[PDB]
Amino acid sequence: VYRRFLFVVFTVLVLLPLPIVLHTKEAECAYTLFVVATFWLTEALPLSVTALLPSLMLPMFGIMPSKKVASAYFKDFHLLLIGVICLATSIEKWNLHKRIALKMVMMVGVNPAWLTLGFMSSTAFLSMWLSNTSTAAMVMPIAEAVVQQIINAKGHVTRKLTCLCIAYSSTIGGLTTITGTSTNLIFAEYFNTRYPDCRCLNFGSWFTFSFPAALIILLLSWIWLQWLFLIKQEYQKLGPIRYQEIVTLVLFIIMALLWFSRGFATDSTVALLIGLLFFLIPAKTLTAFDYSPLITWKEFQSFMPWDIAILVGGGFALADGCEESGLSKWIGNKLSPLGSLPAWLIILISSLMVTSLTEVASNPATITLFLPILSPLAEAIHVNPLYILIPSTLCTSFAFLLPVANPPNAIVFSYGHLKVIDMVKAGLGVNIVGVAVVMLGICTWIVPMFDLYTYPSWAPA
Amino acid sequence: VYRRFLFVVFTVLVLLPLPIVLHTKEAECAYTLFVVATFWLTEALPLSVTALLPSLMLPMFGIMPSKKVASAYFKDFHLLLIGVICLATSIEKWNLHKRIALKMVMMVGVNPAWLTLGFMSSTAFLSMWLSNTSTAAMVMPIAEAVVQQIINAGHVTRKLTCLCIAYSSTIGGLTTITGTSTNLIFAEYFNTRYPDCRCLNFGSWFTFSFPAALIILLLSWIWLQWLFLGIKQEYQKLGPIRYQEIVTLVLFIIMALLWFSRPGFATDSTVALLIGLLFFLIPAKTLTAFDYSPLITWKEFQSFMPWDIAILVGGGFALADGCEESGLSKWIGNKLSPLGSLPAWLIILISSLMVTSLTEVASNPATITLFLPILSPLAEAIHVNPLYILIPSTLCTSFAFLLPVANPPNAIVFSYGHLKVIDMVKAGLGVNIVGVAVVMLGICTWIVPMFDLYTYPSWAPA
Ligand SMILES: CC(C)CCC[C@@H](C)[C@H]1CC[C@H]2[C@@H]3CC=C4C[C@@H](O)CC[C@]4(C)[C@H]3CC[C@]12C
Ligand SMILES: CC(C)CCC[C@@H](C)[C@H]1CC[C@H]2[C@@H]3CC=C4C[C@@H](O)CC[C@]4(C)[C@H]3CC[C@]12C
Ligand code: NA
Ligand code: NA
């Protein structure tokens, strides 16, 4: 009774017994550690309120920030993210993302079973640019209407096979771009901090090592999903193609051709030069007296992730706060026999610990907690840091079990079908295929790309 | 004909004849100067798109950023602004700001002419916390309904009440560093460039400017009432006082009592985050039940927070440092060497009158962004305290009281029926001269013993 308020009686709870430790300087900093890590996993607070808590609690105990090295008022990853969001804002303001999801399904829709590959290929291409949650929330109304008019010409299992294709291929196409999922932005913001001399990570080199990785997972999970389970009038009611979709489509082909083919030759120059045209090209008249452009600043501010910059800096103030106190030395002495395992065994034992924790917690929470653990470990045992951080930001996205992990597969669970055991039987095939393909990747073709066997010059010592 | 598109045929225009200069390294950097300054004043682009233009154009010519000194992932002014916005988010989500605007008018509403002072005192107190544009857009529906039921018991009392809402929303917009938006561009420019100064917080901006605005508020009521003329049922239809307004009002008195009365946790940004982050936690609604919702959500907080101020400041720094890497700051620095022979007080009068005149035709964040990296190099060169010049120029930026294109407070009240354009010029020139004279009286007598304005400090370089 009265456990409809289980957020407030838990946040107020956790701060009460945890002040057993009030005794020294490392016990007070470990109090901030087990509180912010607790509210990130259970998500009792909205994940950026919690990132402001080390900026409040640590000066109260007497642990002040002391880092004083930065540069560059506008960073290069911040200007790439500006130009990508303003392309992804007008592509769904003007409903261009339903033309493509219908035209791709129509082309390869011979449908013995090529409808399923038609649905996966249409929502994995849309996840490279849009967010995973917003692109699964519009193919799912489309696919439910198509599969109802097909059965209006056995029928139960083809409704929950089509459900899992939308939820799983929105995540597989969520990688292959550093701006596809949100957890590819926390990796890229942690890496341009802490390692600001590294120039090996841009838009056109994340796509080259991960598009061969996801095409194998996409083609092998279609075969797995189709195994264990078994429209011209829908495109006609979108209307004719408008003016504001031809302009958006032309700037989308122009921008993506220069990213892969190309001090002004950086990828953040193409993002701002073609991205800032969306604030300029006229779209509507509003009688006339004054036009309106393709996107406005109030719509751009709605789509931009501002909470990622608070989440990264809140993870840095917690990590540096453990270094000023004696906590990083104290647990560093009890874990000295960890540096006797081989380099490949650290990869397998960590990527299986991240692909298992991401099923019960959100993906930006488990990439924020684990990324300042593996990167000190990689410099200590004299490994290239990208050799450990690349297969852990890729196995974070592999959240394919029970529908509390990522909000893609909680949308498709909100429909009628697809009880919980249908995800565990289907997700364990895509999970094992996903881990084995990335483990195959960092042994053969990723190593000659980023020079993963040679300790670089951006790592300290 | 076809000049309904005068934005796109002007932005595309200005970039065409201005590449006469393509010849050297300072001529290419002055090309970026006269483009970004042109789109800030005319506002052909939304004022943060333009701040990203020196981050695009300057690496193309070969002028790279080279500054490498900062600290402190979260700054102290950023944590004060977080806690203020989440108090100003729930105060208008739950309509607490109409209780106060009606209860203050009701109390001093004897109305021979105390209705006018009742309206100014209710919308100047609400501008210390809310934004100037959003607090003039809700007293103006209220005052038009009250002045219509008073005349139903007459033309010049409709446009006297209009100008009280537009002018006292700006006078109460100062006295807080988070009241207007141009008090945030001053405070963000000053914690950059001068990071050793600890003299500027919430509780010392209010002490030097609340005596400055109370004199301008009390003297412009006398001026406005002169040149123009010599409600329990409106409060009853708000309903009874709810649950979510008593909780917001209690945390508003708690937070403001500790700001003025108070190892390293005794700062003003601690009170802002400790009482501000309770608005994400206290339950407000049930939504059947199975899961409550708090007083404010993160999607509503993200809507009210000014994110474009941090882009506008860093875009002004990349343009200012870009002129220093090239030879432009030395080239115009040699042609302006006889400027450093005027007295210290004459620089104040000649600059505050140049900023209070330009802010009538351009927006206030555009004229504080262009002028703040001009006066602060000038104050270090002629050996003056930099706060002695920057304080009376961030205060005369807000004095936009003439024709209704200056600030969006007095374009809202112009959008109603009354108040033709000459009624603002006759009324605004009285509030303008009173405003400049009170700040000039302030920086001579009581502001100087507060910030030590005659002694060159230790945070300025040399
Ligand atoms: C973000 C928060 C958790 C930082 C605190 C993380 C602790 C767990 C991290 C910080 C420092 C890390 C240690 C850095 C140093 C060493 C010594 C090396 O031979 C083994 C790795 C080991 C032992 C790392 C283990 C993990 C570690 C101790
Ligand atoms: C933001 C942009 C405009 C920066 C370029 C501004 C130019 C106008 C600013 C930058 C440097 C400034 C100069 C700094 C040095 C001097 C020499 C001193 O005896 C007179 C002031 C004077 C001459 C300043 C005048 C204004 C100035 C030249
Ligand atoms: Na995505
Ligand atoms: Na205000």
Per-position DSSP letters for B335-363, written without gaps between them = TTGGGGGS-HHHHHHHHHHHHHHHTTTS-
Question: Vertex A209, ends A205 and A212: CA angle to 5°?
Answer: 135
A190, two tokens: 């942690």
The answer to whether B52 and B319 have CB atoms below 8 angstroms apart is no
Token couple for A213: 């990785």
* Token code pair at residue A37: 């890590």
Q: How many CB atoms lie within 10 A of CB B263?
A: 9
Of A372, A393, A375, the C-alpha closest to A385 is A375
Closest C-alpha among B436, B243, B122, B368 to residue B130: B122
Euclidean distance between CA atoms B186 and B395, whole angstroms: 10
In angstroms, the first-to-last Cα distance of chain B is 57
C-alpha to C-alpha distance for A426 and A434, rounded to whole angstroms: 13
Domain ranges of chain B: 76-304
d(CA A446, CA A208): 9
Count Cβ atoms within 10 A of the Cβ of residue A336 and give its class: 0-12 exposed, 13-18 middle, 19 or more buried.
Answer: exposed
How far apart are the C-alpha atoms of B136 and B116, rounded to whole Å? 15
Task: Please indicate the experimental technique that yielded this structure.
Answer: cryo-EM
- Distance separating alpha carbons of residues B37 and B51, to the nearest angstrom: 10
User: Which residues in chain B have their CB less than 8 angstroms from residue A264's CB?
Assistant: 59-60
3-class SS at B43?
coil
Strand, coil or helix: B283: strand
Please, which residues have CB within 8 angstroms of residue B23's CB and are 6 or more apart in sequence?
none
First to last CA, chain A: 57
Containing B285, the helix (H) or strand (E) segment is strand B283-285
User: Which residue, chain included where needed, has tokens 């399923």?
Assistant: A116
Both tokens of residue A271? Answer: 């993002």
Task: Return d(Cα B280, Cα A47) in angstroms, integer.
Answer: 11
A279–B49 CB contact, under 8 Å: yes
- What angle, 0 to 180 degrees and rounded to 10, lies between the N-to-C axes of helices A343-357 and A386-393? 30
DSSP state letter for B284: E
Residue with tokens 């600001």: A196
Is residue B30 exposed (0-12), middle (13-18) or buried (19+ Cβ within 10 Å)? Answer: middle
Main-chain dihedrals φ then ψ at residue B92, nearest 5 degrees: -120, -5
Q: Single out the residue of B367, B309, B364 nearest to residue A297, CA to CA.
A: B309
Set of chain B residues whose Cβ sits within 8 Å of the Cβ of A45: 280-281
How many CA atoms within 13 Å lie on the side-chain side of B420? Answer: 3
Residue B277 · residue B83 · CB < 8 Å = yes
B279: tokens are 């608005």
Q: Name the phi and psi angles at A79, rounded to 5.
A: -85, -20
Measured at the CA of B206, the angle between CA B92 and CA B214, to 5 degrees, comes to 85
Which two structure tokens, joined as six digits, stand for B272?
């802002």
**Cα(B407) to centroid(ligand 4), Å:** 12
Token code pair at residue A257: 């051709």
Q: Which of A331, A382, A388 most suits a substitution to test ligand 1, by most atoms within 8 Å of the C-beta?
A: A331
Structure-block tokens of residue A242: 């408008």
Position in ligand 1 atom list of the atom nearest CA A37: 3
B74 within 8 A of A320, measured Cβ to Cβ: no
Contact A73 B11 (CB under 8 A): no
Q: Whose CA is nearest to atom 25 of ligand 2?
A: B378
Q: Across the interface, do B70 and A65 touch by the CB < 8 Å criterion? A: no
Minimal CA separation from B407 to chain A, in Å? 19
Residue B430 tokens read as 């009285």
Compute the distance between CA of residue A219 and CA of residue A40 in angstroms, rounded to an integer: 34
- Rounded Cα–Cα distance for residues A378 and A386 (Å): 9
CB atoms within 10 A of CB B302: 18
Task: Note whether A52 contacts B277, CB cutoff 8 Å.
Answer: yes
Cβ partners under 8 Å of residue B257, min gap 6: none
Helix/strand/coil (H/E/C) assignment for every residue in A243-299: HHHHHHHHHHHHHHHHHHHCCCCCHHHHHHHHHCCCCCCEEECCCCCCCEECCCHHH
B39 contact residues in A (CB cutoff 8 A) = none
Task: Quote the CA–CA distance of B257 and B268 in Å, as a whole number.
Answer: 11
In chain B, residues with a C-beta closer than 8 Å to the C-beta of A285 are 4
CA–CA distance, B312 with B365 (Å, rounded to integer): 9
Calculate how close chain A gets to B137, using CA atoms only, in Å. Answer: 18
Ligand nearest to the CA of B37: 2
Residue B89 near residue B64 (C-beta atoms within 8 A):
no
| Cβ burial, residue B46 (10 Å; 0-12/13-18/19+) | middle
Burial class (CB in 10 A: 0-12, 13-18, 19+), B77: buried
3 state DSSP class of B294: strand
Is B306 within 8 Å of A297 (Cβ atoms)?
no
Instruction: Decide if B217 contacts B171 (C-beta within 8 A).
Output: yes
DSSP A338: G
Structure tokens at B368: 């504080």
DSSP B177: T
C-alpha to C-alpha distance for A180 and A127, rounded to whole angstroms? 6
Using alpha carbons only, how large is chain B's radius of gyration in Å?
A: 24
State the Cα–Cα distance between residues A175 and A394, nearest whole angstrom.
8
Distance B221 CA to ligand 3 centre (A): 57
Tokens of B151: 């005349």
- Token readout for A233 is 């009038």
| Cα B279 from Cα B83, distance rounded (Å) | 10
Q: Give the C-alpha separation, B197 to B183, whole Å.
A: 17
Q: For residue A282, list its beta bridge partners.
A: A293
**What is the spatial distance between Cα A398 and Cα A354, in angstroms, rounded to a whole number?**
9
- For B116, the token pair is 């006018």
What does the alpha-carbon distance between residue B288 and residue B314 come to, in Å, rounded to a whole number? 45
d(C-alpha B49, C-alpha A394), whole Å: 33
Tokens representing B11 are 């932005």
CA–CA dist A356, A374 (Å, integer): 16
Proximal ligand: closest to the CA of A397: 3
B415 contact partners, CB below 8 Å, separation of at least 6: none
Residue type, B435: G
Please list the alpha-helical segments (H only) found in A291-393. Answer: 297-303, 307-324, 327-333, 343-357, 363-380, 386-393
Interface test with B, best of A1, A28, A55, A276 (most B CBs within 10 A): A55
Collect contacts of A439-446 with beta carbons under 8 A, ≥24 apart: A439/A347, A439/A348, A439/A351, A439/A391, A441/A209, A441/A212, A441/A213, A441/A391, A442/A347, A442/A387, A442/A390, A442/A391, A445/A209, A445/A212, A446/A209, A446/A390
Q: Which two tokens stand for residue A445?
A: 């073709």
**Phi (first) and psi of residue B285, to 5 degrees:** -135, 165
How many angstroms does the Cα of residue A332 sit away from the middle of ligand 1? 6
Token pair belonging to B356: 């209070």
Ligand closest to Cα of A314 equals: 1
The one-letter code for the residue type at A451 is D
Beta strands A292-293 and A282-284, pairing class? antiparallel
Name the one residue in this structure whose structure tokens are 């051709």.
Answer: A257
**Six-digit token string for B144:** 């038009």
Side chain identity, residue B186: F
Residue carrying structure tokens 């996801």: A214
CA distance B191 to B20: 38
Residue B387, judged by CB atoms within 10 A of its CB (0-12, 13-18, 19+), counts as buried
Q: Scanning every residue of chain A, which has its alpha carbon at the shortest distance from the alpha carbon of B10?
A: A280
- SS3 for A69? strand
- Distance of CA A182 from the midpoint of ligand 3 (Å): 8
With 0-12 / 13-18 / 19 or more C-beta atoms within 10 angstroms meaning exposed / middle / buried, residue A182 is buried
- A43, two tokens: 């998500």
According to DSSP, the residues that pair with A284 across neighbouring strands are A292
**Cβ atoms B84, B272 nearer than 8 A:** yes
Give the single-character DSSP code of B293: E
Nearest 5°: the CA angle A210, A213, A219 is 135
Task: Using alpha carbons only, give the angle A242, A248, A249 rounded to the nearest 5 degrees.
Answer: 90
Judge contact between B129 and B179, C-beta under 8 A. Answer: yes
The structure tokens 């807000």 sit at: B398
How far is residue A23's CA from residue B92's CA, in Å, rounded to a whole number? 43
CA Rg value for chain A: 24
State in Å: Cα B21 to ligand 2 middle.
21
Q: Residue A292's beta-bridge partner residues? A: A284
Q: Which two tokens stand for residue A320?
A: 């540096």
* Contact criterion met (CB below 8 Å) for B391 and B352: no
Please, are residues A54 and A318 in contact by the beta-carbon 8 Å criterion? Answer: yes
CA distance A345 to B67: 42
Distance between CA atoms of residues B352 and A432, nearest Å = 69
Give me the residue label for tokens 């007008």.
A90
| Token pair in block for residue A186 | 């926390």
Q: Strands A292-293, B293-294: parallel, antiparallel or unpaired by DSSP?
A: unpaired
The vertex-B403 CA angle with B398 and B408, nearest 5°, equals: 55
Chain-centre distance of CA A40, in angstroms? 16
Are the C-beta atoms of residues B314 and B51 closer than 8 Å to each other?
A: yes
Unique residue bearing structure tokens 């991401």:
A358
Tell if the CB–CB gap between A8 and B59 is shorter than 8 Å.
Answer: no
